[PDB]
């Protein structure tokens, strides 16, 4: 362990999408840096998925995010969104969060958005979303949340690379 | 010419923000490289407030942008006033300039600043570029209705958050981030 970065998937995101992104983030982190940042891959899908792991990455399945939470645009999302928010409010409270990146459609975006913009301005926070070109006010609110429009390796690549950029340059100042 | 990157804005009012961000794009591009990409600041202002250089950056004045463009349909557009006609002609002249840079495959990326007016100017031209070339816009409008600006492209809007215009505490951290985000996209694409 070390300072962490999170690649996050929602229901929407297919395994191979998340793998490519995490792989590209890590690589790029290593490549941009001047010599280290870990890549924790987290699943926050509201529906079950036949996979509680992501290649060789430190993982945290949807059951675990959820676990750390106590009890309106869906109940499922309302629940998980909250559980995510608390989850990385902790890892940021440990001063061990260099940024977060996730992908989702309209549902997944609205899940990640709120959980993300609850993080201090300046903390790299990225969402590769299919609702980027449209009304974003409700997602970005009044914060520095970046929405990359849509997934495709070329766009996964630039998003991934853009995130590595913000992180590294923020940590190497 | 080596790969090249344009940091674009209306320097007549955003000079400090442009310099600052380019300062950051440049050092990040350096830092993150393993090898050499130039940073060119370019002015698209249409006001009397004329600007001739930006620190020690390669610089192209708004009249240089203008001079590579032949007038077209833009001239006969609507327009509440002549400022808006200047903005439209400039926007199209940017489109040509960028397009020329990309035909001469100098073009490794574009980034820009702007409010409502800048963002329309940069949008229109940034999206004429093929998908994949890094194109970012630090805009006070990213939080709102973006369909207009991004259309169907890969253009990314960075929200301006705003501790205000100019440079201070929290606009700085988004400018840095935007800068480094852009740098990583450019290097990553070139060293991939």
From Swiss-Prot, chain A:
Region span, N-terminal inhibitory domain NN: 1-173
- What does gene deletion cause? Increased sensitivity to tobamoviruses (ToMV,TMV).
Q: Which residues does the record give as ATP binding sites?
A: 12-14, 46, 73, 105-108
- Role summary: Inhibitor of viral RNA replication which confers resistance to some tobamoviruses including tomato mosaic virus (ToMV) (e.g. isolate L), tobacco mosaic virus (TMV), tobacco mild green mosaic virus (TMGMV) and pepper mild mottle virus (PMMoV), but not to resistance-breaking isolates of ToMV (e.g. LT1, SL-1 and ToMV1-2) and tomato brown rugose fruit virus (ToBRFV). Prevents tobamoviruses RNA replication by affecting the association of tobamoviruses replication proteins (large and small subunits) with host membrane-associated proteins (e.g.
- What family is reported? Belongs to the UPF0261 family.
Assembly and interaction partners = Homodimer. (Microbial infection) Binds, via an ATP bridge, to the tobamoviruses avirulent (Avr) replication proteins (large and small subunits, e.g. tomato mosaic virus (ToMV/TMV) AC P03587, tobacco mild green mosaic virus (TMGMV) AC P18339 and pepper mild mottle virus (PMMoV) AC P89657) to inhibit their function after the translation of tobamoviruses RNA, but before the viral replication complex formation on the membrane surfaces; this interaction is not possible with resistance-breaking strains replication proteins.
Give the miscellaneous note.
Answer: Transgenic tobacco plants expressing Tm-1 exhibit resistance to tobacco mild green mosaic virus (TMGMV) and pepper mild mottle virus (PMMoV), tobamoviruses that cannot multiply in tomato.
| Official protein name in the record | ToMV resistance protein Tm-1(GCR237)
Q: Which gene encodes it?
A: Tm-1
Covered range within the whole protein?
A: 7 to 201 of 754
UniProtKB/Swiss-Prot annotation, chain B:
Superkingdom as given in the UniProt entry: Eukaryota
Q: In the record, which residues are listed under signal peptide?
A: none
Cite the binding residues for ATP. 12-14, 46, 83, 115-118
Stretches the record annotates as N-terminal inhibitory domain NN: 1-192
Q: What happens when the gene is disrupted?
A: Increased sensitivity to tobamoviruses (ToMV,TMV).
Its UniProt miscellaneous note says: Transgenic tobacco plants expressing Tm-1 exhibit resistance to tobacco mild green mosaic virus (TMGMV) and pepper mild mottle virus (PMMoV), tobamoviruses that cannot multiply in tomato. The Tm-1 allele present in the tomato mosaic virus (ToMV/TMV)-resistant tomato cv. Craigella isolate GCR237 (AC A7M6E7) confers resistance to ToMV but not the tm-1 allele present in the ToMV-susceptible tomato cv. Craigella isolate GCR26 (AC A7M6E8).
User: What is the annotated role of this protein in its UniProt record?
Assistant: Inhibitor of viral RNA replication which confers resistance to some tobamoviruses including tomato mosaic virus (ToMV) (e.g. isolate L), tobacco mosaic virus (TMV), tobacco mild green mosaic virus (TMGMV) and pepper mild mottle virus (PMMoV), but not to resistance-breaking isolates of ToMV (e.g. LT1, SL-1 and ToMV1-2) and tomato brown rugose fruit virus (ToBRFV). Prevents tobamoviruses RNA replication by affecting the association of tobamoviruses replication proteins (large and small subunits) with host membrane-associated proteins (e.g.
Describe its partners and assembly state: Homodimer. (Microbial infection) Binds, via an ATP bridge, to the tobamoviruses avirulent (Avr) replication proteins (large and small subunits, e.g. tomato mosaic virus (ToMV/TMV) AC P03587, tobacco mild green mosaic virus (TMGMV) AC P18339 and pepper mild mottle virus (PMMoV) AC P89657) to inhibit their function after the translation of tobamoviruses RNA, but before the viral replication complex formation on the membrane surfaces; this interaction is not possible with resistance-breaking strains replication proteins.
Q: What protein name does the entry list?
A: ToMV resistance protein Tm-1(GCR237)
Shown residues in whole-protein numbering: 7 to 201 of 754
